C-alpha cells in the first residue's frame, strides 16, 4: 500500500511519515519546502530505516503532479499541503485561497485522472468558527468561520463532499485535527518551520532554549478563565498514528469525518506553565492584543474516532512539552 | 473610464458591453469561448459603432492576464467569466471550482499587483439555496446551496468580503442576478451559447423557430402552484444597466450587495406560454425528471437597488420573450 503525503516534509506529515513506514507502508512525499527543510525526510529516513520518495515541488504544478502519479501506484492520498496560520490568512487570503483551494484542484484532478479515489484531508477545528458547543462533536454545526485559512478548510470539505456527489465510488476522510504539539520520542524530528513560528509550542520551545526572547500571548480578554486562549492540544505522535489507524481500517466509498483532539483543554497561560515545568525555569511571556481570526476556546469529542478507529490520543501535555524541548534542546536552530 | 469585462463575449456581458459603450466608457473583453462566439463582439461593435478591444484567452492564465493590464489602464472589473450550469456543476464539480475559483484568485492577484481595486462580480440567486424568507431580501440568509455552481458563487463572494478585509480600500460589488432573458431590440445580437443550450429560455426560443424538438420540463412535483420551478426572469438589457448603474453611482470604498430581479415569478409553464403568445403557435414541451441541484422558488425585492442605484428593472415577460424570439427568428443557428 503506497501513500502519497502532499506537504510530506512538513511538521504533522513527517510523524506521519514514521508511522506509516513503521506499519509497513510504501510512502511518497511531495513539498515545496515553502515551511519545511528537506532535512526533515532524511530524519524520517534515519528513524525507521526506510525510504521516503521526495519530489521537491508545488502541488499545483500540474506536469509535476502528472509525473507523480504517472511514475507511482499509488493507493491512499494524505493531504496536508497548505498554508497554516488563522492571523497571516486575515492578512494574505489571496495567498491562502490560491495556495489552499488551488493544490486541493490540481490534486483532485490528476487523481481522478489516475483513479485514485482514497483521500484523507487535514482539515481544523477553524471549521467550526465559535462553536456552537463544546465539547465540539461531529454533529457541531459547521461554519461561522473567521479567518480565510479556517474559511479555506471549510470550503475544501465542501469541494471533496460534491467530488463524491459526482463519484461516490470515493472514499473521503475529512480528519478536523485540534492542536498537534511535540516531537518524536528520538527527538531528531520535531517542528520546525520557516520564519518566525506562528504556531504556539515551537515559538515557546525557542524561548525556553533561549533563541527567541518572549512569548507573545495573544489576548487576555477572551471569555475563559484566565482570558487567554483555549485549546486542545493532542501530540503528534497520537495524531499521526490516527492517519495510520483511517487507512488500516477504512476500506469502503463514502465521506467521513473525524475530530482528532484529547478532549482536554488548556489555555496559553497553562501551555507556558506545562514548558516552565519541562524545562524547571520561568519562560518569559508578555500579553499582547488579539490575533485576528482567533476565537476563545475550541475542545473536541473525540468518542467516533475511538469506536470506528480504534483511536485514541492519551499522550499529555506533559508528554507534548517534555518532547518538543527534546528535540529543541538537542536542535536549537531546528534542522 | 475604461471596463475590463471578463467571459466579455457571453451572453449579459455583450449586453453589458453595448450599454456601457453607448455611456461612453471603452470596453476591453477576455474570453476563451468555452460558450460564446467571437462574432458575438463584432455585433456589439456593430450596434454601438464603438470598439471592444479583443482578448482571446483564459482569465487562468496569469500571463495573458498580466499583458491585460500591463498594455490597458483599468478601472473597473466586471467578472462574468464563470461555468454556469446547476445541474451540469454536480457532475462536474471539479470543473465548476476550477475554472470559478481559480479564474477569480488569478484575476484579484493580477488587479493587486495593479492597484485596481474595483470589481462587479457576477453572483447569483443560487447562493440563497432554498430561500430562508420570499421574495429575497439582500438580508435573507446565504448558504444551504445545493449545488457546485451556487457553491462556488459564495465561495468566491467570501473571497472577495476576504479581500476587503485585508485592503478595506477596495470596491466590491456582489450582484446576485436572478434569471436574465431576451435579448437586445436590434436583433442582431442574443443567447447564443455552445452545444445544447443549458438555460431554459435558449432552449424555448430554440423549440419555437424549429431548431430544437421539444422543451425539457426538468421536475412537476415542487412546492409551487403548477409544481414547475418558479423564478424572477429579468430583462438581460435591464440587468445590462443595473451594472452601468454600479459605474455611475459607486465611487467610494466598499462591500456592497444587490439582488437584481424583477420581483415577478413565473413558472416554467407560464415562460413557455410567453414564448406561445410570441409566436402565434403551441411550443411542444414534456414532463421529465427533476435537474440535480434546482430549489423550487427563487424571486427577488430589489428595492435597494432602486433606491441606492436608482435602476429598477420593468421590461416585462413579454417583452422578453418577443425580443428572444426576434433574435432567434433571425438568427436561428445564433451566430
Ligand atoms: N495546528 C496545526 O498544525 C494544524 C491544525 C489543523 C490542521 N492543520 C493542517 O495540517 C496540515 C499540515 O500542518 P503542519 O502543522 O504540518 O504544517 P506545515 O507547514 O509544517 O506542513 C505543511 C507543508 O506543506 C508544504 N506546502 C504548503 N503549500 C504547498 C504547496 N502548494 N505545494 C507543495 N508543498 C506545500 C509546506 O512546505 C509544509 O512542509 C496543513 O494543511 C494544516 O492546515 C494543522
Ligand atoms: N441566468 C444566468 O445566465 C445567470 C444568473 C446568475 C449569474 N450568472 C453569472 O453571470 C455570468 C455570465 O453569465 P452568462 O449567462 O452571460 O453566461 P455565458 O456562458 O454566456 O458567459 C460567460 C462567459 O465566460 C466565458 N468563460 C468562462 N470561463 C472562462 C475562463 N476561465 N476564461 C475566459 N473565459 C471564460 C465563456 O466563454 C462565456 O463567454 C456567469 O458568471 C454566470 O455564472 C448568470
Ligand atoms: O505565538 C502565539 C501563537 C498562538 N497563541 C495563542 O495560542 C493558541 C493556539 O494558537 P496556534 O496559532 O498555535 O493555533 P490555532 O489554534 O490558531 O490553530 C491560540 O489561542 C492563540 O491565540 C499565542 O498566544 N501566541
Ligand atoms: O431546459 C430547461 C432548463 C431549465 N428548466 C427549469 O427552468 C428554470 C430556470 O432554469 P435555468 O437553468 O434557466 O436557470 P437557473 O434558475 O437554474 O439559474 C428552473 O426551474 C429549471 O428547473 C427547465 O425546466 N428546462
Ligand atoms: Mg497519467
Ligand atoms: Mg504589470
Given at each position: 500500500?503506497?501513500?502519497?503525503?502532499?506537504?510530506?516534509?512538513?511538521?504533522?506529515?513527517?510523524?506521519?511519515?514514521?508511522?506509516?513506514?513503521?506499519?509497513?507502508?510504501?510512502?511518497?512525499?511531495?513539498?515545496?519546502?515553502?515551511?519545511?527543510?528537506?532535512?526533515?525526510?532524511?530524519?524520517?529516513?534515519?528513524?525507521?530505516?526506510?525510504?521516503?520518495?521526495?519530489?521537491?515541488?508545488?502541488?499545483?504544478?500540474?506536469?509535476?503532479?502528472?509525473?507523480?502519479?504517472?511514475?507511482?501506484?499509488?493507493?491512499?492520498?494524505?493531504?496536508?499541503?497548505?498554508?497554516?496560520?488563522?492571523?497571516?490568512?486575515?492578512?494574505?487570503?489571496?495567498?491562502?485561497?490560491?495556495?489552499?483551494?488551488?493544490?486541493?484542484?490540481?490534486?483532485?484532478?490528476?487523481?481522478?485522472?489516475?483513479?485514485?479515489?482514497?483521500?484523507?484531508?487535514?482539515?481544523?477545528?477553524?471549521?467550526?468558527?465559535?462553536?456552537?458547543?463544546?465539547?465540539?462533536?461531529?454533529?457541531?454545526?459547521?461554519?461561522?468561520?473567521?479567518?480565510?485559512?479556517?474559511?479555506?478548510?471549510?470550503?475544501?470539505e465542501q469541494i471533496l463532499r460534491d467530488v463524491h456527489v459526482a463519484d461516490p465510488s470515493w472514499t473521503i476522510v475529512l480528519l478536523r485535527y485540534f492542536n498537534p504539539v511535540g516531537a518524536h520520542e528520538s527527538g531528531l524530528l520535531g517542528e520546525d518551520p520557516k520564519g518566525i513560528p506562528a504556531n504556539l509550542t515551537p515559538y515557546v520551545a525557542k524561548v525556553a532554549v533561549g533563541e527567541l526572547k518572549e512569548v507573545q500571548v495573544y489576548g487576555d480578554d477572551y471569555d475563559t478563565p484566565d482570558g487567554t486562549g483555549v485549546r486542545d492540544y493532542i501530540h503528534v505522535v497520537d495524531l499521526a498514528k490516527g492517519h495510520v489507524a483511517v487507512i488500516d481500517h477504512i476500506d469502503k466509498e463514502g465521506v467521513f469525518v473525524y475530530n482528532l483532539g484529547t478532549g482536554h483543554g488548556y489555555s496559553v497561560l497553562e501551555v507556558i506553565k506545562a514548558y516552565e515545568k519541562a524545562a524547571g525555569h520561568p519562560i518569559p511571556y508578555a500579553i499582547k492584543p488579539r490575533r485576528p481570526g482567533d476565537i476563545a476556546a475550541c475542545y473536541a469529542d473525540a468518542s467516533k474516532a475511538e469506536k470506528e478507529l480504534g483511536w485514541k490520543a492519551e499522550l499529555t501535555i506533559d508528554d507534548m512539552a517534555a518532547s518538543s524541548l527534546n528535540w529543541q534542546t538537542k536542535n536549537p536552530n531546528g534542522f
Open positions: 500500500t503506497t501513500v502519497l503525503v502532499t506537504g510530506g516534509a512538513g511538521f504533522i506529515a513527517t510523524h506521519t511519515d514514521i508511522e506509516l513506514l513503521n506499519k509497513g507502508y510504501d510512502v511518497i512525499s511531495v513539498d515545496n519546502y515553502g515551511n519545511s527543510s528537506p532535512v526533515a525526510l532524511e530524519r524520517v529516513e534515519q528513524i525507521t530505516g526506510k525510504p521516503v520518495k521526495r519530489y521537491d515541488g508545488d502541488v499545483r504544478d500540474e506536469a509535476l503532479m502528472e509525473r507523480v502519479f504517472a511514475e507511482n501506484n499509488i493507493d491512499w492520498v494524505i493531504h496536508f499541503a497548505g498554508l497554516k496560520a488563522v492571523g497571516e490568512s486575515v492578512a494574505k487570503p489571496i495567498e491562502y485561497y490560491d495556495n489552499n483551494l488551488y493544490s486541493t484542484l490540481v490534486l483532485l484532478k490528476v487523481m481522478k485522472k489516475h483513479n485514485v479515489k482514497k483521500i484523507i484531508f487535514s482539515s481544523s477545528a477553524t471549521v467550526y468558527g465559535t462553536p456552537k458547543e463544546l465539547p465540539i462533536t461531529e454533529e457541531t454545526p459547521t461554519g461561522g468561520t473567521t479567518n480565510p485559512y479556517g474559511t479555506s478548510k471549510l470550503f475544501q
